[PDB]
């Protein structure tokens, strides 16, 4: 087994956590099932003992050969040497629960006979089930499906425990003694599970409780079933409200913009263009603005996400070829993403020039014909145009040609004003840009 286990990029550790989860779920299901129901008979004890020995071997191989080899983070740096990982496992609060789990109480099978309540300390290894829950929530892209699966599995487990406790109350009152207890006719687990299902969902339709212990049992089981049904509705409400939060927030902002435009009697061509923008921004980004997402991130992950998207594109630019890399990084951080519709002008012939355009996932077309509509240059994604307009001052640069968007063009935009607000910190690159302006202009 590898001297170290990563526990994040390791899928064999997820398979091992599935194995310890199968052993733990075997214990937590089949210890009340063998404890209450008479399925642990004398000609069946070898299969139960073989399965318990396999689950204890899975418990011991976790404690001795897997869980000491787990990597962790101590003060920031990743620990990989085996003795320090072993000491971190031994000084954990996981190890107390694990060594309290496999305490071998099965040697009390000699004294008190076979009893599944001696293995109940094996139900204390819940942390491996919670780590498998956390790793399967992390590896899944849509985690609400696993939240529904976990809520269903918790519901089936509490119904299993309620069926076992009802069969215990049936054997405590005597089988077939009153009308409320299990009569003994068909399958034991299936009809006690039917009673647990009709009690814990508060369906009713069962025979009424006759003696006082059965009235106390039906009272507590109906009250617990009210809270189980309430937690089931609350879990499904939380799953739906967390799954559709972004879509309903986008729809609320779109209906706010539509109600603002209907308040001011803005015409339906402009409202159709605004609705087309909102539809393409939901179909492409699945969010309104990337700026309010990126502004809550720290600055290093912002700089890394700005470098991996546009730094090769700005290093292709001959205007900013000579500049220093930190000013390029600040103009990477201060880029603004604007979506242009089909037919929208990113540059009108004769308008003022203030912006540098980095086209990503779109196409713009430079209309420079004799009549003014013949497409001269079609600029695909990853192109930079209008970067010389950032150096002219005052009026300065006027756009010489019409540049319209061919389809939906997602431009990235650096203003002249934000370039000057960046360039007050960097005088050397400002001198290189101004001497390039004096040479070329």
């Amino acid at each position: 087994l590898p001297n170290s286990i990563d526990s994040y990029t390791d899928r064999l550790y997820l398979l091992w956590l599935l194995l310890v989860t199968l052993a733990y779920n075997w214990n937590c299901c089949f210890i009340p099932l063998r404890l209450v129901f008479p399925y642990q008979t004398a000609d069946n004890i070898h299969y139960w003992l073989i399965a318990d020995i396999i689950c204890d071997i899975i418990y011991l191989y976790d404690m001795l050969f897997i869980q000491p080899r787990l990597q962790f983070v101590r003060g920031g740096d990743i620990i990989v040497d085996s003795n320090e990982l072993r000491k971190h496992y031994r000084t954990s609060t996981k190890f107390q629960l694990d060594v309290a789990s496999i305490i071998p109480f099965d040697i009390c099978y000699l004294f008190f006979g076979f009893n599944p309540m001696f293995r109940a300390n094996r139900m204390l290894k819940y942390t491996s089930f919670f780590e498998f829950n956390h790793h399967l929530e992390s590896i899944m892209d849509k985690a609400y499906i696993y939240r529904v699966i976990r809520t269903t599995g918790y519901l089936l487990f509490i119904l299993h425990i309620n069926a076992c406790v009802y069969y215990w109350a049936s054997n405590y009152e005597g089988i077939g003694t009153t009308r409320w207890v299990y009569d003994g006719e068909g399958n034991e687990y299936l009809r006690c599970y039917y009673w647990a299902v009709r009690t814990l969902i508060t369906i009713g339709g069962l025979p009424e409780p006759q003696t006082l212990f059965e009235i106390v049992f039906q009272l507590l089981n109906f009250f617990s079933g009210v809270f189980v049904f309430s937690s089931l509705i609350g879990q499904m409400r939380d799953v739906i409200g967390a799954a559709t939060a972004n879509q309903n927030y986008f729809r609320a902002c779109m209906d706010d913009t539509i109600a603002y435009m209907n308040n001011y009697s803005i015409p339906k061509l402009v409202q159709k263009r605004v609705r087309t923008w909102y539809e393409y921004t939901w179909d492409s980004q699945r969010m309104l603005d990337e700026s309010d997402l990126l502004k809550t991130l720290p600055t290093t992950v912002q700089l890394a996400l700005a470098i991996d998207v546009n730094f090769s594109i700005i290093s292709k630019v001959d205007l900013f070829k000579g500049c220093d890399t930190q000013m390029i990084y600040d103009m990477l951080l201060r880029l603004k993403s604007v979506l242009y519709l089909p037919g929208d002008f990113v540059c009108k012939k004769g308008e003022i020039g203030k912006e540098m355009y980095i086209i990503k996932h779109g196409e713009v077309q430079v209309l420079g014909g004799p009549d003014g509509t013949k497409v001269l240059v079609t600029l695909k994604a990853g192109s930079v145009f209008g970067e010389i307009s950032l150096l002219a001052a005052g009026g300065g640069n006027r756009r010489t040609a019409n540049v319209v968007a061919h389809g939906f063009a997602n431009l990235l935009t650096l203003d002249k004003k934000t370039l000057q607000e960046i360039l007050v910190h960097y005088p050397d690159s400002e001198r290189i840009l101004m001497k390039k302006a004096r040479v070329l202009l």
């Binding site: 009713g204 049904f229 409400r237 902002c253 300065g396």
Partner: protein, 456 residues
């Protein structure tokens, strides 16, 4: 011809293909399970299944020639549409939905319509129709409760057919739980068959459970599985209605939180109750006149192209009527209608008094101001919608005898929605237009030496 998927024609085809899919789901499970619908009205189902299958072949040829966006533009190369359809997993479900299993009608003799269950594989057109309908409609919560009612009707109907098929497999009338003896003419009608199976599924899946209890262990297992499926489905649907109601009145909750926060501030800070009545009356106006959201935050995410189009569709005919902004360039007026900031005033609220610092120019939209006197309210000029004042206060020409003062007592007669072009926003918008800035200074100097200036 290439079908654009964002058209009205594509939504009309989504309706025309969501009709035989819902037909196939509902009517194929009750024809498969009930066996008198399939035997009695046989030529009706042959005509309807031939129409559904020719709609399915028309659906695969529409999907072979539908557009998809690549680099923001729709692809119209039909060979590229055919290859992009062929490498899709929807094409496999479509050709499995159109295999001729009705040739298996030649052996089994047309009483077994469960061979058309491959026709249920086109569920994605029904889900696409529901998604495009709740994207297209203006009642999204009403369509969402209607879609949840349609989902529970499909689930109640499918469970009715499943309960009737289980009662047919166990045997009719042999048990107290199953559907009764169909040789009896009371229970032998198809109407009582479907309506009692629908009654059993509505009682069972909603976890009310007032049906006769099971007597065999297969029936116990089916009623346990059906109660579990019903509590999961209806807990999901009650949580969905709860999330939809909690997002229906989220804006009223936010507005009531703002109202109660400002109320607790005003009772905490010992504000006098006439001003507290003015604040509560302004909040009553703001809720009763549907003006609760604000322009700066509802136009925060749009680009400046569409914000510029929105702002020139309201402010540009008023801004072109200003004496200094009469003959300006078009891009400067686009920048100036982007710089406009709304303010709302109560009745009797003074916009500006004599001697205040004039640094804003107010454009009047939906309101009536009054240039009143100093001591009492003697209205000299009643300014209306489309009017303006205070452009000389934001020009600040050299040597003015006003000296950025207001020289007018302007108070609001009713509720006004004024738009403010400040001096800082004007001098920031004029940074790209120095010639127009000199024209503004010369036009304001023209106005002031028609009235009052000192040569300094």
């Amino acid at each position: 011809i290439v079908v654009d998927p964002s058209s009205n024609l594509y939504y009309r085809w989504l309706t025309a293909i969501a009709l035989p899919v819902f037909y196939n789901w509902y009517l194929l499970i009750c024809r498969a399970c009930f066996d008198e619908l399939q035997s009695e009205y046989l030529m009706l189902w042959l005509v309807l299944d031939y129409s559904a299958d020719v709609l399915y072949v028309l659906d695969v040829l529409v999907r072979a020639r539908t557009g998809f966006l690549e680099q923001g533009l729709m692809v119209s190369d039909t060979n590229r549409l055919w290859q992009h359809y062929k490498t899709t997993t929807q094409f496999k479900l479509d050709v499995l939905s159109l295999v001729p299993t009705d040739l298996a009608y030649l052996k089994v003799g047309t009483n077994y319509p469960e061979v058309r269950f491959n026709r249920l594989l086109k569920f994605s057109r029904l889900f696409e129709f529901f998604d495009r309908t709740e994207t297209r409609t203006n009642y999204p919560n009403m369509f969402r409760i209607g879609n949840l009612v349609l989902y529970i009707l499909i689930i109640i109907h499918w469970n009715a057919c499943i309960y009737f098929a289980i009662s047919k497999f166990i045997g009719f009338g042999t048990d107290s739980w199953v559907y009764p003896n169909i040789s009896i003419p009371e229970h032998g009608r198809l109407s009582r068959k479907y309506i009692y199976s629908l009654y059993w599924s509505t009682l069972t899946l909603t976890t009310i459970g007032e049906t006769p209890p099971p007597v065999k262990d297969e029936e116990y297992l089916f009623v346990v599985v059906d109660f579990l499926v019903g509590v999961l489905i209806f807990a999901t649907i009650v949580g969905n209605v709860g999330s939809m109601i909690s997002n229906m009145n989220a804006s009223r909750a936010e507005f009531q939180a703002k109202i109660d926060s400002i109320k607790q501030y005003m009772q905490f800070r010992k504000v006098t109750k006439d001003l507290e009545t003015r604040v509560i009356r302004w909040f009553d106006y703001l809720w009763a006149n549907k003006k609760t959201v604000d322009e700066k935050e509802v136009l925060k995410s749009l680009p400046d192209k569409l914000k510029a189009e929105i702002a020139i569709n309201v402010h540009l005919d008023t801004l072109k009527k200003v004496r200094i902004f009469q003959d300006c360039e078009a891009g400067l007026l686009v920048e100036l209608v982007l710089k406009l900031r709304p303010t709302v005033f109560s009745p009797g609220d003074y916009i500006c008094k004599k001697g205040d610092i004039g640094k804003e120019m107010y454009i009047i939209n939906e309101g009536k101001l009054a240039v009143v006197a100093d001591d009492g309210v003697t209205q000299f000029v009643v300014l209306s919608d489309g009017s303006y004042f205070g452009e000389i206060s934001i020009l600040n020409i050299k040597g003015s005898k006003s000296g950025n003062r207001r020289t007018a007592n302007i108070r609001s007669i009713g509720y006004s929605d004024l738009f403010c072009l400040s001096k800082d926003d004007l001098m920031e918008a004029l940074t790209e237009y120095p010639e127009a800035k000199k024209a503004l200074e010369e036009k304001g100097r023209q106005i002031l030496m028609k009235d009052n200036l000192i040569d300094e």
